[PDB]
Amino acid sequence: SPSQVRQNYHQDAEAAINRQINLELYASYVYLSMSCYFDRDDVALKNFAKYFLHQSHEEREHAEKLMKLQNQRGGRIFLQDIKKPDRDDWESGLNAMECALHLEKSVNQSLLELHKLATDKNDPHLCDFIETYYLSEQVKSIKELGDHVTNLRKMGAPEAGMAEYLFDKHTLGH
Amino acid sequence: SPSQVRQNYHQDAEAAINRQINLELYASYVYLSMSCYFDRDDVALKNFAKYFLHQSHEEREHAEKLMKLQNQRGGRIFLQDIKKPDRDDWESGLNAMECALHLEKSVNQSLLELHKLATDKNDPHLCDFIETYYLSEQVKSIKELGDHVTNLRKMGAPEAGMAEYLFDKHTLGH
Amino acid sequence: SPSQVRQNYHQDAEAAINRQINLELYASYVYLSMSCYFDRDDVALKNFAKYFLHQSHEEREHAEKLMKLQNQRGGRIFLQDIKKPDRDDWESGLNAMECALHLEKSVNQSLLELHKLATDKNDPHLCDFIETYYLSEQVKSIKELGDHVTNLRKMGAPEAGMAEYLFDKHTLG
Amino acid sequence: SPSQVRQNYHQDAEAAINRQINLELYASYVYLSMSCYFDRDDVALKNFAKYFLHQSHEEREHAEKLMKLQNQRGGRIFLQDIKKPDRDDWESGLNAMECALHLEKSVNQSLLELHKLATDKNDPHLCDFIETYYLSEQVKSIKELGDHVTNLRKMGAPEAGMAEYLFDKHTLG
Amino acid sequence: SPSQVRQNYHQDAEAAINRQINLELYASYVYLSMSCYFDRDDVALKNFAKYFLHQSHEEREHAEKLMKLQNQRGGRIFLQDIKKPDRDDWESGLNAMECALHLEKSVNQSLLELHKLATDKNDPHLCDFIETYYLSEQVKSIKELGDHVTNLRKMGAPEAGMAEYLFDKHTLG
Amino acid sequence: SPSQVRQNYHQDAEAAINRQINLELYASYVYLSMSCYFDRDDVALKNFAKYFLHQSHEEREHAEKLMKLQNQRGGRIFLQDIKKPDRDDWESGLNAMECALHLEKSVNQSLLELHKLATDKNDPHLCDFIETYYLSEQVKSIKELGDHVTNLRKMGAPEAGMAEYLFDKHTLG
Ligand SMILES: [Fe+3]
Ligand SMILES: [Mg+2]
Ligand SMILES: [Mg+2]
Ligand SMILES: [Mg+2]
Ligand SMILES: [Mg+2]
Ligand SMILES: [Mg+2]
Ligand SMILES: [Mg+2]
Ligand SMILES: [Mg+2]
Ligand SMILES: [Mg+2]
Ligand SMILES: [Mg+2]
Ligand SMILES: [Mg+2]
Structure with a gap:
């Protein structure tokens, strides 16, 4: 078998x-949905859209690598439905970022829970793969997103309307 | 409104x-599910895997550009769950290609029905958009897939064991 | 004949x-009028002027390309007076953009009436010409003007006085 | 099946x-027959010959592209006899341009009957294929041929003996 | 104020x-209208068309630089209807060239009136501006068009049919 | 005369x-028909199609070069209907090559009867032309087609399904 x-x-x-x-x-x-919101003519923050599109494609890469790992170790991939995100309207640049921060922390939880599962089953290869390709990446993304929420808040986003505009230009523009 | x-x-x-x-x-x-299958150690057809990974990324491109069009015309993007494929075992390179042909014919049907709806609503821009980016690429993919199915069959796939191996090298390795 | x-x-x-x-x-x-307005010393938004000057030249190119199409199909060009714009003073960066948007959608509407006329007379060449060179350019222009209007609004134009200034630098520069 | x-x-x-x-x-x-005539030692307008030679090769490309389309759509090609042209002697540069103008208008009309067939069958891929590679190319060609016929006429072709010679150099060379 | x-x-x-x-x-x-006439399949003089298209774009550059000067100096631009040219059919290359000469002369006279006015108001910046960018450009344009008229005439245009055809290649190519 | x-x-x-x-x-x-056949989605041998398409264009060049020779020598070209091929369905890679071989040998036979005719009329220039441009080209084509037919057969074409596929890749690719 x-x-x-x-x-x-x-x-x-x-x-x-x-x-x-x-x-x-x-x-x-989720990221694709955020991207699409920022491309809307009544939102229209092009580098917010581009930032989330890029993050969407990185997450796909994260999934494909985990598929490769599965096949490497002789496991079998069983796909399930990919659930629509919990909303369509992301309300603002600040709220999109806070929601991405939250998401990224959820995904890190799941990954830390996987590493523990790997540790308890004595699977050092899987422990190493997770550490090497996923854990520091997540930590780096979480820190980035926190830095973005902090700046958008201190700038007065979303109520002060120059905030999200100038952030779009100077931080995400790049 | x-x-x-x-x-x-x-x-x-x-x-x-x-x-x-x-x-x-x-x-x-669907295409990613197929790619994963060919990457299995007990299937091990690497260019079939690369070919379907590439189709998968193209379809994601098709989706993204339809989201851009939706925003361009001022419609509102409403995402739904992406349903898993109808199986995880694709049986053989021949079968995967026949299923791919079938899929592409289903997607063309929907595009042609979308074009008809655009024509009846007198939306020439939408008509042109569908023509220019989708209909020709579909006819091209449908013809390629049919050529692949024909070759694999004439070659004796999957019962003749060298058929899928050589097709992998000469047709999908170029 | x-x-x-x-x-x-x-x-x-x-x-x-x-x-x-x-x-x-x-x-x-109309676009040239707008460009002139932004080059005023009491308005003084160089990238807005450049932007509208460029749009003004694009429209002339659209006109010339319809003239070539007319001659191509064996029609005859008959020119009329080009009417002056409805105003001289475009009041602000936001206001000009929103008038530009309205302007593009009036052109787009006319071009869709044109396409309809060509459809009903079974002139597939004229339908394709219009789609290939006018319709998707219009849609793209309408989306861009729409984007610009929204940012300006969100920024607080025109009453927050830094809004058009910075838009002029970061978006049109 | x-x-x-x-x-x-x-x-x-x-x-x-x-x-x-x-x-x-x-x-x-037809275009090849014309090329042949201009290469005659008693007609001898090298650039007329080369022009109609290039038109012949284009038309063959058009034929090949339609066969590609047939196969793409899963149709089956059925070839028939290619009829000889209705004459051997094309008379002059002017007359050959006039007959070419009539030929391209007849092929255009047949492309238009084809596109109305495609439209009636709700085949938007075929309609677009015809528009994209045939219809605009036909209008361009008819316009070009009309332009050539008009100059040759204004020049005094074929009775003013210098007219086809110089056309051949200046317009076609 | x-x-x-x-x-x-x-x-x-x-x-x-x-x-x-x-x-x-x-x-x-006016130059654009003339351009369109030479692009007709029944006139078909491509270089006469290019030439007057080019003059058309130059004249528009002249308008733009005058709008620029106006703002530089603190005047306000007031645009008026641009009247259609006095005809659509320009008859021949000779006659278009003759009418182009009359047009450039009428514009020159208006520039000269403008400079007299600048002089009488002791505006040396305006006088210099007019001399630098307009006055010697006009004189060169008027001499060029007279030269074109003279050749066309001597060549037998438009009755000698080869005349506008060969002028179109040798002078305007 | x-x-x-x-x-x-x-x-x-x-x-x-x-x-x-x-x-x-x-x-x-004939060779174009064959090319269209191998481009069929239920035949699907791209290098076979490619191969016969290049042959078809080479035959057109042979036709054009005889047309030039005719004019060169003072003869007059009289074109006839180009008959359709004897079938539409070329059945397999092996069969098409064997048909091409028979075709090339029939054309060579005609070319030798031509040479005989020019020999009997003491037309050493026509004999030389035929030899220089036709006869050794036919000999090489005939040899190449015979090689292809031999390899296809030895390979088990068309019953062994991999034969034409692999031939398409290694010999024609
Ligand atoms: Fe700033
Ligand atoms: Mg991830
Ligand atoms: Mg460890
Ligand atoms: Mg798709
Ligand atoms: Mg249409
Ligand atoms: Mg326009
Ligand atoms: Mg054709
Ligand atoms: Mg089209
Ligand atoms: Mg001027
Ligand atoms: Mg001075
Ligand atoms: Mg031959």
């Missing part, structure tokens, strides 16, 4: 990876 | 674009 | 093209 | 594409 | 700069 | 050259 390549790869880890695949695809979709 | 940019853009065209968006996201996911 | 090249080209299409030539030239003049 | 790739492609469109193909090939032969 | 930058700029010079602007724009439109 | 350049050019040679022109154009059409 098991793959000829399979070794030290617990069925709980396999299952966890397929959930994590789902989650990265979800995040990709 | 309506967007400041909105002109000659019927609510049914809007709704139809949002459905087409979902369908293109669906297609992308 | 008829031209040796004239095929499947209805005289109502021939008249409607001459009206569209006039409208494109009219839009060129 | 139908091709595995066939979708939304009516049997009458398939038939009409096969007739267009033959027409394109016929026109190529 | 007047612009912060206004100094030594009389109200009549300001009005008279607004009439000149309109004159330059009319002349642009 | 003979051409001013005609010398030592018999009217049977003149008629025979007109027949070879028709035969070369026929060969061009």
Whole structure:
């Protein structure tokens, strides 16, 4: 029954990876939705849109690499429905960022829970893969997003209407 | 209520674009499921995997550009769940290509129905948009996929074991 | 009468093209007025002026390309007076953009009436010309003007006096 | 039973594409016959010859592209005899340009009957293919040929003996 | 009350700069009309068309630079209707060239009137501006067009049919 | 009434050259049919199609070069219908090549009967032309086609399904 390549790869880890695949695809979709909001003619912050589109494509890459890992270890990929995001209207540049921060923290939780699952099953390869490709990336993104929320807040966003405009230019422009 | 940019853009065209968006996201996911399959150690056809990963990324491109068009015309993007594919085991390179042909024919059907809806609402811009970016690329993909299916069959795939291996090298490795 | 090249080209299409030539030239003049206004020493927004000057030249190119199409199909160009813009004083950066938007949507509406006329006379060449060179340019222009209007509004133009200044630098510069 | 790739492609469109193909090939032969005539030691207008040679090759490309389309849509090509042109002797530069103008108007009318067929069958891919590669190319060509005929006439062709010689140098060379 | 930058700029010079602007724009439109006539399939003189298109764009540049001067000096631009040219059919290359000469002379006379006015108001900046960018450009244009008229005439235009054809290649190519 | 350049050019040679022109154009059409066939979605051998398309264009060039020779020698070109190929469906890679081989040998036979005719009429220039440009080209084409047919057969074409596919890649790719 098991793959000829399979070794030290617990069925709980396999299952966890397929959930994590789902989650990265979800995040990709969330970011795509945010991107689309900022491209609207009545929002119209082009570098906010471009920033989220770029983040959407990075999340897809995160999902594809986890698919590759699955196949490497001789697990089997089981896709599920990718759920629409919880809203269509993201309200403002500040709120989009706070929602991305929250998302990224959720995804980091899931990943830290995976690493623990890997640790308890004594799977150092999987521990290393997660550490090497996902954990510092997340930490870096969380810090970035926090830095963005902080600046947009101190600037008076979203009520002070120059704020999101100038941030779009100077921080995301780049 | 309506967007400041909105002109000659019927609510049914809007709704139809949002459905087409979902369908293109669906297609992308079908193609990624196939890519994952060919990457399995017990399938191990690397250019079939690369070919479908590439189709998957193209379909995501198709979705994104339909979202750009939606914003351009002043419609509002309403995302839905992306449904998983109808299976995770694609059986063989021949079968994957026949399913791909089928898929592309389904997507062309929807595009042609969208074009008809645009024509009946006298939306020449939407007609042109669909013509210019979608209909020709569909006819081209449908013809390519049919050529692939024909070759794999004439070659004796999948029962003749060298067929999928060589096709992988000569047709999909170029 | 008829031209040796004239095929499947209805005289109502021939008249409607001459009206569209006039409208494109009219839009060129409106844009030129706007550019002049932003070059005023008491208005003094250089990138707004440059922006409208560029749009004014694009409209002249649209007019010239309809003239070439008319001659191509064996129609005859008949020119009319280009009317002056409805005002001299465009009042602010926001206001000018919003008048530009209104202007582009009036042109777009005319071009869609043109396409409809060409559809009903079964002139697929004229339908394709219009789609290929006018309709998607219009849609893109309308989206851009719409974007610009929104940012200016969101910024507090015109009453927050730094709004048009910075828009002039970061978006039009 | 139908091709595995066939979708939304009516049997009458398939038939009409096969007739267009033959027409394109016929026109190529007509242009080649003209090239042959101008290369005669008793006519000897090298650039007329080269012009009609280039037109012949273009028309063959048109034919090939329609066959590509037939196969893309899952149609089946059925070739027919390419009829010889209606004469061997084309008389003059002017007369050959006039006959070329009549030929391209006849092929255009057949493309327009094809596009009205495509439209009637709700085949937007075929309609766009025809617009994109055939209809604008036909109008350009008819306009060019009309321009040539008009200059040759104004020049005094063929009775003023210098007219086709100089045209051949200045316009066609 | 007047612009912060206004100094030594009389109200009549300001009005008279607004009439000149309109004159330059009319002349642009006149040259465009002439361009369109030479692009007709029944006239078909491509270089005569290019030439007058080029003159059209120059005249518009002349209008634009006059709008610039107006703002530089603190005057206000007041645009008027641009009147259609006095005809649509320009008859021949010779006659278009003859009418182009009469047009450039009428514009020159208006510039000379404008300079007299600048002189009488002791506006040396305006006089210099007119001499530098307009007066010697006009004289060169008027000499060029006279030269074109003279050749066309000596060549037998428009009755000698080869005349406008060969002028079009040798002088205007 | 003979051409001013005609010398030592018999009217049977003149008629025979007109027949070879028709035969070369026929060969061009045959090979184009074949190309269209391999481009079918249910045949789908791209390098086969590519191969026969290049052959079709080479045959058109052979036809055009005989047309030039005819004019060179003072003969007059008389064009005939180009008959359609004897079928539409070329059944397989192997079969098409065997048909091309038979085709090339029929054209070579015609070219040898032509040479014989120019020999019997003592037309050493026509003999030389035929040899220099036709005869060794046919010999090489015939050899190449025979090589292809032999490899396809040895390979198990068309019953072994991989044969034409692999041949398409390695020999024609
Ligand atoms: Fe700033
Ligand atoms: Mg991630
Ligand atoms: Mg560790
Ligand atoms: Mg798609
Ligand atoms: Mg249409
Ligand atoms: Mg326009
Ligand atoms: Mg053609
Ligand atoms: Mg089109
Ligand atoms: Mg001037
Ligand atoms: Mg001076
Ligand atoms: Mg040959």
